[PDB]
């Protein structure tokens, strides 16, 4: 879910996922005015990672952000294709730094291996200026993590508060109960004075 | 009422002149800064900062001053460095002077270069344009790492879309204006964000704080009266039911 969350940014992460662009105006006309929310366009992009998972391990990768979730099917391709989750060689282990160096010198395929990759709890983005000394340089930053994409509960305190007023609402209903019994009570000795008064 | 008190304290912080620009970044960024400038042994390219003094904002683009502050400062946190070697020290310089934010790390040595070959062409002026810029090596890191040589500021939601759909020579990204509170960010054609203007001004502003601060009062003022909107609608509500 942190490596989801820090490929694919929150706004993407929050956005609707739209078919097409056309459906996108069409139901953003009614919803956007209403509620300001980021949409996503199903884009058709590769949906499957570029070069073969053992390729990417060679380096000490596991695999890819497409085979790190799950979900919805028009989820998940527009994730694979705008996004494109299965281009990330995403692992949970560190790389050797000898072929982290590797992968900051371009490849003798012509560019680098890959310009976004996940290793252990960080991640490494390797561009190239346009101008200039053109240096290909890497970018190393330490990845958090989050409870996105997890149906679990973490706002505990507000499951704790709305049952403690569960209980207190219960026990007011309970002695709201015992004060109309005590008024029915007080309503049947009325009427048996009365009983024996009329008689 | 607590989102206006909130807005009173920013109002107060920033009035007061502690939200120095040194400090607008983070708080101890001037520490990082000057433990980098001690510590750039390994940085072939100097980690120099503060850059916000070098790219500052520049007048006439007030309507997405903050816009564009919140864009270059997000942005702005990457400094210049060689190699990965500086990244370490850069790390280490973090966990030494303990700055609150961390700083990303850009492992490019500093170099000056001609961006035309990328110009933005529009009738907008380009952020290089819309910013002031002293240090030409930070100046063209800038341009290279943000692209903002390939951006037009469009100041219109659909005019923006309008706009990319035309395409003209280098353009990606608008910054239109909705509002003081939030603007628009338009790319791909129709591809559009409302997103809130930043309200801590990482960014420099070449502008007194006093803006911000009178941005803030009247913050304050339209909150005070959504509150005593809100509070006539149900004391309305409340009158008619009891």
Not at chain 1, 83 to 110: C, F, Y
Not at chain 2, 74 to 97: E, G, Q, T
Not at chain 2, 124 to 146: G, N
């Amino acid at each position: 879910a942190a490596y989801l969350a820090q490929c694919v940014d929150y706004n993407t992460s929050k956005a609707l996922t739209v078919v097409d662009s056309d459906s996108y105006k069409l139901f953003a006309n009614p919803i956007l005015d209403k509620f300001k929310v980021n949409l996503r366009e199903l884009s058709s992009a590769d949906t499957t990672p570029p070069v073969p998972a053992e390729t990417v391990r060679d380096l000490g990768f596991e695999g890819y952000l497409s085979d790190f979730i799950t979900g919805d099917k028009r989820v998940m391709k527009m994730l694979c294709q705008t996004s494109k989750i299965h281009t990330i060689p995403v692992s949970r282990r560190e790389l050797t730094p000898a072929q982290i160096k590797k992968l900051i010198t371009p490849r003798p395929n012509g560019k680098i291996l890959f310009k976004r990759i996940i290793h252990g709890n960080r991640l490494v983005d390797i561009k190239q200026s346009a101008y200039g000394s053109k240096q290909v340089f890497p970018t190393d930053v330490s990845i958090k993590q989050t409870n996105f994409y997890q149906g679990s509960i973490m706002s505990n305190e507000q499951k704790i508060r709305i049952e403690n007023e569960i209980i207190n609402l219960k026990n007011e209903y309970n002695d709201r109960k015992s004060t109309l019994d005590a008024l029915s009570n007080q309503k049947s000795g009325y009427r048996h004075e009365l009983s024996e008064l009329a008689s | 009422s607590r989102s206006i008190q909130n807005k009173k304290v920013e109002l107060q912080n920033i009035a007061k002149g502690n939200d120095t620009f040194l400090m607008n970044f983070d708080r101890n960024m001037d520490r990082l800064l000057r433990t980098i400038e001690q510590r750039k042994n390994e940085f072939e390219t100097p980690a120099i900062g503060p850059l916000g003094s070098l790219v500052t904002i520049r007048k006439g683009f007030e309507k997405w001053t903050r816009s564009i502050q919140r864009a270059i400062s997000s942005s702005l946190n990457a400094f210049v460095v060689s190699n990965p070697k500086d990244n370490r020290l850069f790390r280490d310089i973090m966990r030494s002077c303990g700055i609150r934010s961390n700083i990303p790390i850009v492992t490019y040595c500093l170099s000056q270069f001609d961006y035309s070959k990328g110009r933005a062409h529009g009738n907008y002026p380009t952020i290089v344009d819309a910013l002031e810029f002293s240090k030409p090596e930070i100046e063209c890191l800038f341009v290279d790492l943000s692209r903002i040589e390939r951006i037009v500021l469009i100041e219109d939601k659909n005019e923006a879309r309008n706009f990319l759909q035309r395409n003209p020579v280098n353009v990606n990204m608008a910054l239109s204006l909705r509002d003081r509170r939030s603007g628009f960010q338009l790319s791909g054609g129709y591809r559009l964000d409302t997103v809130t203007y930043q309200d801590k001004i990482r960014l420099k502003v070449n502008s007194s704080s006093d803006n911000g601060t009178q941005y803030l009062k009247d913050l304050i003022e339209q909150e005070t009266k959504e509150l005593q909107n809100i509070r006539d609608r149900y004391e309305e509500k409340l009158s008619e039911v009891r």
